[PDB]
Write a protein that binds this ligand. Structure first.
Ligand SMILES: Cc1cc(CN(CC(C)C)S(=O)(=O)Cc2ccccc2)ccc1-c1ccc(S(C)(=O)=O)cc1
Length: 227
């Protein structure tokens, strides 16, 4: 590996993301002034927890589809044995989604883009899990504060997935290979864009994990009931 090949990896990771980022940043931003009227909010609040579950599950299913496509477009990823490909996605896809989420988050009025407009967290009242919902908003707020760029997301979420410490891995060292190269790519690019400052300011890989497991387990009470 040289700097030229690292930069190729960077450029590549950033192009897989672009091809799989699901929603254009520019559409997201242009629509920040498109906010739910309190009438429309009230409409969401009257819905049963189940209707809301149906919608959220669909949006999360759709989101995860894109994360998978992203990972497939990661060099090295497909070369992995298929057991490991599962292991990584099963452990990492949700975390990546929670990270991608901040693109759709407006920190200036603490709202999120949901089904065509921006709404605050009271939109989700019917689900009856506001500690989970607020913690997600806080997590997205933290990242929006860093002004986390598209390429930073690309490189950062790649490392979320490509983690050789996931229990279950058969050919661990191949993952370390990809992991190590992605860390180099990520760190290098920070220098090139003068964003060294954010590493210290990122939420701990613990924080992402305890959010996602807390998240997945309220998902799993919802899908007990109600496939
Ligand atoms: C994935 C998603 C979800 C939501 C709905 N939920 C989050 C809000 C409550 C913030 S939930 O489903 O996760 C909550 C929930 C559901 C069930 C049980 C417990 C908890 C709203 C916007 C998105 C979204 C879609 C696309 C992008 S992208 C890549 O930029 O294009 C980013 C974000």
């Amino acid at each position: 590996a040289s700097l030229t090949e690292i930069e190729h990896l960077v450029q590549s990771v950033c192009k897989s993301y672009r091809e799989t980022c699901q929603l254009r940043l520019e559409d997201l931003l242009r629509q920040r002034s498109n906010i739910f009227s309190r009438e429309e909010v009230t409409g969401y609040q009257r819905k049963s927890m189940w209707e809301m579950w149906e919608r959220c599950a669909h949006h999360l299913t759709e989101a995860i589809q894109y994360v998978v496509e992203f990972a497939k477009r990661l060099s090295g990823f497909m070369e992995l044995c298929q057991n490991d490909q599962i292991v990584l996605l099963k452990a990492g896809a949700m975390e990546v989604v929670l990270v991608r989420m901040c693109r759709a988050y407006n920190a200036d009025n603490r709202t999120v883009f949901f089904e065509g407009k921006y709404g605050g967290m009271e939109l989700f009242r019917a689900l009856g899990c506001s500690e989970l919902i607020s913690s997600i908003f806080d997590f997205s707020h933290s990242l929006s504060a860093l002004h986390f760029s598209e390429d930073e997301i690309a490189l950062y979420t790649a490392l979320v997935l490509i983690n050789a410490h996931r229990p279950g891995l058969q050919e661990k060292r191949k993952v370390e290979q990809l992991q190590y190269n992605l860390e180099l790519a990520f760190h290098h690019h920070l220098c090139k864009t003068h964003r060294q400052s954010i590493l210290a300011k990122l939420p701990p890989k613990g924080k992402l994990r305890s959010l996602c497991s807390q998240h997945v387990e309220r998902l799993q009470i919802f899908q007990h009931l109600h496939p």
